[model samples]
Target: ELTLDPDTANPRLILSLDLKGVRLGERAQDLPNHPCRFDTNTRVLASCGFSSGRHHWEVEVGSKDGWAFGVARESVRRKGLTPFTPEEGVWALQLNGGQYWAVTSPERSPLSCGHLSRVRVALDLEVGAVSFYAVEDMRHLYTFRVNFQERVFPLFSVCSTGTYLRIWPAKLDTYLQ
Candidate 1:
């Protein structure tokens, strides 16, 4: 299971007690100015970091207009308006203004998938690939190929006050098979 790291969350982000869900807060919390905290961007990193092996996780986006889900290098910048792109050590799929985008360097590629309610992220560290899919129909959204040099963490962000992103719990039955 994966959970958000409260220490890395931006002040304006509200993380559930279980750390599986995150939403935008009405006001910034009076938290410590930890070096790992995101001082500018509305983002957070998962508690677990991966350096190898294949892993999969699902997040319920539920038609949120402004949100981002993907992976970020452990050393990725925590301050300033750093662009969310592979070049900057982050690879993510973003939804804004009713459009889906694959956040690439220099330019963000547009995706054609309409209004995905849930998204599955599959990361194969050995294969140097990260892929996104629309959970309902299992349609591929985008994929990024990169030779990661450092540990990477699952990244998440939500921008709307009433919107949230929930990480789906792993089903033990599927893995037990």
Candidate 2:
């Protein structure tokens, strides 16, 4: 239910995760109802949480980066720049607020080897004002907030072939309305 203001990018999109019946095994809430190429048709809710409630929603699993800009991977040191693999959640964001952010989490297609046991992510972005990014790998990212601005040469995108995502409203204050 996190409402957001998008940038000048075409098909502007913002994504969050809070919904119902999302038991994995090929589940989706579709665009419009969520947000993506279809656009969020409903009013943006500010937070979400309710206990075992019914909330239909969509999600966006995107990727962004230039040809040579990316973090590397390592088996010993979980922190540091290393070669990233496709099975991971890889994305880069050039916020209008003049800050550069990236999602360094790795993901598995079957959703088994993936660390996103909740399969949810939320971002608070304010074009040229503020920006934040998240990834499934919560282990590495203890916290990511803004003290943050925008970019062109560092332009990147969220992998869209199947990145349409969502966040449902809830009774929780910090989640979504």
Candidate 3:
């Protein structure tokens, strides 16, 4: 049940009324200058933050031209252009220029995989690992092992025009089982 937080959204990002989806807008929105707002990157954070336990969520990208999704520490800098990496408190996978990359420290790592329509993120705090998977085939994509020290929130961003990202509800079948 992850949802986007409007307070942390960049001005150029438009969140859906239900806060389940987000897209880039041509014009910047007149939003309050909140400390958590992303001023430079076209990104947003989840409404809830987690400091322990295992959690999983999915995002529907649907062949978007450019997008990034993962988790960021609640205290990560929100101003200016900082590289999205573990050192900077962000652990994410990006899709740009028709390629997939793990936004790692020092250098971004390329990932070899088939087209992805949906991405699944699994975070295990005790194990200090965050993993990404291609939902269609359940293929493992990438994983980041980090020693988290504070609360972290799910993060998202879209780069190309007319592109959007959506947070999918947890599967009811799995819940029932």
What TM-score, over all chains together, does every model reach? Answer: 0.91, 0.24, 0.92
TM-score result, candidate 2:
0.24
TM-score of structure candidate 1: 0.91
Q: Give me the displacement of residue 86 in model 1, in angstroms.
A: 1.9
Give the distance in Å from residue 12's predicted Cα in candidate 1 to where it truly belongs: 0.4
What are the per-residue Cα lDDT tens digits for candidate 2 across 1-177?
A: 433222211232233233211111122333332221212111122223222212222233322211111111111112222223323222232111122223334521221132222222333233211112234543331222422221111112322222332332323211110
Instruction: Report clash pairs, candidate 1.
Output: none
Question: Positional deviation of 51 in candidate 1, in angstroms?
Answer: 0.6
- Candidate RMSDs in order: 8.2, 16.5, 8.1
Tell me the whole-model lDDT of each prediction, alpha carbons only.
0.83, 0.23, 0.83
Model 3 misplacement above 4 A: 170-177
Better of 1 and 2 by TM-score: 1
lDDT of 3 at 136: 85
Q: How well is each residue in 1-177 modelled by candidate 3, as lDDT tens digits? A: 789999999898888999999988888998898888888777799999899999999998847556788998888888886666788788988876678888887978989987888899998888998899999888999999889999988988776575688999822111110
Deviation (Å) of 56 in candidate 2: 19
